[PDB]
Amino acid sequence: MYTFVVRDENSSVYAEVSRLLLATGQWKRLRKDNPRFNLMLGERNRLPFGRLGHEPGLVQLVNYYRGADKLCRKASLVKLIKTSPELSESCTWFPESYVIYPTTDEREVFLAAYNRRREGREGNVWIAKSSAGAGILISSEASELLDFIDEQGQVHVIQKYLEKPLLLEPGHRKFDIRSWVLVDHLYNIYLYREGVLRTSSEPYNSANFQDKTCHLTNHCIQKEYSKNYGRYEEGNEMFFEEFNQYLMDALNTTLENSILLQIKHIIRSCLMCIEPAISTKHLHYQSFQLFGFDFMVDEELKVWLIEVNGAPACAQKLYAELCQGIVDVAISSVFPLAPTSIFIKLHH
Amino acid sequence: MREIVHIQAGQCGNQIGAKFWEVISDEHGIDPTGSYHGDSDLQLERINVYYNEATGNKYVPRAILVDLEPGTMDSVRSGPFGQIFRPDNFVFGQSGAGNNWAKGHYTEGAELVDSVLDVVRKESESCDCLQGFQLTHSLGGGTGSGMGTLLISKIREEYPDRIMNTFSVMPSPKVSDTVVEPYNATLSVHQLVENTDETYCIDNEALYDICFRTLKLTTPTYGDLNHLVSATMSGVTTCLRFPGADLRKLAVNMVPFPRLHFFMPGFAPLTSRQQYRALTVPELTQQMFDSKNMMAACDPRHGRYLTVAAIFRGRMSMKEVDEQMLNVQNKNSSYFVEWIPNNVKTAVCDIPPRGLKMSATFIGNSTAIQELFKRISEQFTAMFRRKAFLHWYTGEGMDEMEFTEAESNMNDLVSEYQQYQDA
Amino acid sequence: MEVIELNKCTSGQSFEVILKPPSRDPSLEEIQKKLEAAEERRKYQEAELLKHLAE
Amino acid sequence: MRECISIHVGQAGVQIGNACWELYCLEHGIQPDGQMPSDKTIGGGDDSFNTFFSETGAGKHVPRAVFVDLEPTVIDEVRTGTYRQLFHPEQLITGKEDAANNYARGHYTIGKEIIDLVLDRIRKLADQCTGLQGFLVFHSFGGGTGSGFTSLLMERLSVDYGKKSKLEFSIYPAPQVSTAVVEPYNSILTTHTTLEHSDCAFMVDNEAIYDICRRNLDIERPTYTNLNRLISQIVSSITASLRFDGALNVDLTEFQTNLVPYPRIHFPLATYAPVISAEKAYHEQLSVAEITNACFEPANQMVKCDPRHGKYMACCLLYRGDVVPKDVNAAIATIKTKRSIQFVDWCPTGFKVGINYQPPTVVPGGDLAKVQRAVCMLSNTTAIAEAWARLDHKFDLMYAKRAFVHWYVGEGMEEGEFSEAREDMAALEKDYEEVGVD
Ligand SMILES: CCNC(=O)N1CCc2cc3c(c(OC)c2[C@@H]1[C@H]1OCc2c1ccc(OC)c2OC)OCO3
Ligand SMILES: Nc1nc2c(ncn2[C@@H]2O[C@H](COP(=O)(O)OP(=O)(O)OP(=O)(O)O)[C@@H](O)[C@H]2O)c(=O)[nH]1
Ligand SMILES: Nc1ncnc2c1ncn2[C@@H]1O[C@H](COP(=O)(O)OP(=O)(O)CP(=O)(O)O)[C@@H](O)[C@H]1O
Ligand SMILES: Nc1nc2c(ncn2[C@@H]2O[C@H](COP(=O)(O)OP(=O)(O)O)[C@@H](O)[C@H]2O)c(=O)[nH]1
Ligand SMILES: [Ca+2]
Ligand SMILES: [Ca+2]
Ligand SMILES: [Ca+2]
Ligand SMILES: [Mg+2]
């Protein structure tokens, strides 16, 4: 019998994992404060890693990599890419970004590169993001961008906006590619076979950045500010099968060749970079974690990384399959119970 | 030397005490004449915990035998090891106590208690470093129950910084001598609540059920019941009698709240006379925690373990002992309160008891023990609501108020257990 | 990565390597007070016990 | 030359002391009878080993040590042990009734009766010192004597020897070899009362020593003897600089200077390598790079924790055996390019290195194999606060119910001291986080 605890009731992914574990009859759920557990589904904030692996006779496993926040925070992610030799400041798959502190700070470097673009006639549109979310500004002038950051009061990043995105037809609209990646206790990198494209239903309008219903593709912005929400695809969610068929009929290519090779390369690069800092190979407890990578594709079929989510959700149609995959490769691999794999192992 | 002074009072106390000294005298190699004839110096390592060394290298138990009638002690003096006891330590009257707590505590017992304290003081004075006292008695009678608890009160007054430990046999209607046992037991439990540090609760119905259901004894006798008790007493005193471990450190780790110091003892194996089959460490561990091996007739699954002490005896794998002990509490962690980390402690002893290659003794401080005090309380109230049989006690100077108070004290003890079974 | 303050002897040597530059105890009486205070609380508890046993 | 006096308190302190002084004798060529043929100066001398050993006119080298336990059973083993000749009766102090795993009993009830006697026996050793550096105090956190009496002695030592330095070797409690349920209480009570009186303290988690013995020595169920021999090797490599010629950590003051920039954060993490089983016939001798790389593996630390998720304030590398500076810097270079070694901003990123050419000595018949080179790393990293977090959590679980508190109040302690000690540990935990996290 295996025992586990649940410390994040807001997790939709691991609420299903808990249901699957109980449904096997060989796992028993305990109280959130009982220390005699094999598996912890820890909380998102201040997970007590220091108290794991000190229970005699218990192999303990947790569903988060201590230190992976460096990759899953927009500010620290930029710092990681700019300061890591593996991911040089000149890596071609990450947009030019700068960390701007409202009140170590790159506000001056951003202005310098802005003036280089302002001097020439090259596109000089930038976007400002932060950790609040749920606070985004797309402007052509640096003054307006830096002013909004000082008024918010949080660490932000100024990143070059993709003025030339790939547009799905019919619609002439932007989109986003979420990829789910699972890293097990052995630091194997598994890319979920199924991705999801979060598409905008409004036609991409380059003239007006004020109307962020076509520029921002977040599901929340579409289901509240989009008149054409759900017109082209159910819930503005296009899956790989359709997107692949589209790329063939329109651009005479496959999803694997034009995009998926860059995605796997990016995933491998980011995760291999931090492996020495977060690996639990010789550690007294073990970790695995599910990540959400967000990619943008431009009109030249070039993939760009925009964000990495450490506590991501899943697509409704894919919850069952993915969560079962988590139990198979991440949990049952350490705690065996009594091949058409849904994952692609990114070797390294 | 951390000497322990042993006291056995009344019929039950002296019969189980006699068996206890017969059992551990064999383990330490002492014969019925007090002469040592063992083969391992491990037998004499801490022999001074229970035995004094007399002239000629004789070993005399540090035991005081007390009773208000001579009958049971005469049979002890004529028993197997009756001669190893110092004759001066037989203190007895002639009137008896008539299964009457008042007679033991207030009248007949009061007249004799000073004589007993004289012997206790003589045994204590010749102790290099007295740990405390160990009392064997029943709670259903008059002498062990009433005079036993009077002795404990007088001993605490004269030795307030010493540990007081009792083996207390709880009455049961299934193994009953008189209808007044619930009265005597209820009056005693309050004395124990206030004046002992550790009390092993031995329920006579549990002992009966074990002799009948498990040992396949169609007609259990008191002798059969006492076989289980002596085997249990040997187990719970192993850590005191062999290198490893004193009464205060036991209390410190077993008693998180002063009043909740009533332990459920258990023993394994207990086999019907199949007695040659070897027992693996997993089997010992499962049986030791099994309700059928408990001596308090309480269902552990009806409460939670505040603390647990375990003792494994014999040549076995300590690695496998730790593994199985971790397995028990890792698989049933809901029955161990989470607000006392690592509340299960295990000891090992290479010397196995006579007749067994391996044995396991269990000491649990469980909140399920409240079921025992609740049984007594119900039986008490059923008679007290009609004042039945009270005249035996008012005739000795007691009044009804003292029974009402004993009743309330018992129900408070039950409530105190209930607050931690949910906390 | 500079080695500084190298000191050598017959038993061994020691040195320092820099990879990067940087960016009232209680008195004897006060202790006796605490010890004696704890003993008084200890004598008060025993006197109460003995008084309770006297009742 | 300046003398150091070692004090061993409680069972853990005493038994660890016996293992260390056994090892010291083997290292310095001192036979069990106290004779030292290599010492050509008879009856005196100011050599490095005289920091720990005085000398009689007959040529006996007597440890500058005091053993103190509230019960006699453990110290009586020293009186009859192999090195009984080494010590004289005045050095061994035993009580009658131990602290029953109760801090209050060791600190107040029982400690009050014996503290004056211990201090007087210490004064005797101090009176034969031309210049005393300070004291080395060995004790457990969890025991009643090791916790309660040690904190009392540390307070009085500060009064009588205000200028002298005090270092600790502390045994952190692990349930796999634990002896009491209330050890979290005693640990936090004694840390709170000893914090201001200790200049530098080396914590050793029995859990780590236990697993190192099972993993590297192939011991299924390690005993105290196994644990103490390994601990004494680590203590030996920490104190070698005081007992041999050298220029690094030559006096107790230098430990504080090199390892403790902020006084409250004075708990350096010790990491040791290699630990090789003596039952292994064939063994490939490890290199300078390999043993140095092993100093950054949590599996070799005296306290399990992850320094990758903290920050360093200082780092010392203490080598014993065939090691030359060239190999050390070569190994450090490559390790810095593969390890997460983050120093606080207000500290230089570097390593103080000490090399003693004499390889580690192993007790004949012990479990540790002879090796050509070994290293002990002393790094002051915030990651060691994980041990405080673990300990404070167990404390919070019990004290929220007041479990076992009556045992301490019954000995004269007030319930308020529980909360005061916990509040001090709370401030300690936040100091580490303020130093190591962004
Ligand atoms: C040196 C003693 N070592 C030791 O392992 N034990 C554990 C088992 C045990 C069993 C006994 C016994 C004991 O004491 C004489 C002990 C002692 C004692 O002391 C610590 C301790 C004890 C008991 C329970 C504990 O926790 C619930 C505990 O806490 C760690 O007498 C009656 O049967
Ligand atoms: N490493 C190691 N730990 C020990 C040793 N002896 C005891 N311990 C640990 O110390 C703690 C118990 O404290 P002790 O030193 O035994 O108790 P004490 O200091 O003698 O105080 P008392 O309560 O009076 O007996 C437990 O956590 C033990 O695991 C030892 O020899 N080596
Ligand atoms: N550098 C860039 N270039 C072009 N478009 C960008 C961009 N950064 C962000 N966007 C657009 O803005 C949207 C919001 O960006 P981002 O992914 O940072 O927010 P978010 O944290 O809400 C996504 P999630 O809900 O997955 O965490 C993206 O979906 C993308 O369409
Ligand atoms: N286990 C056991 N219980 C006994 C024995 N003798 C009496 N009892 C129980 O003890 C109670 C009677 O008390 P008893 O010791 O005979 O009275 P006392 O002499 O006045 O102390 C009843 O509950 C009996 O069941 C015995 O030998 N063994
Ligand atoms: Ca009379
Ligand atoms: Ca000399
Ligand atoms: Ca000082
Ligand atoms: Mg996000």
Ligand SMILES: [Mg+2]
């Ligand atoms: Mg009778």
Ligand SMILES: [Mg+2]
């Ligand atoms: Mg001790």
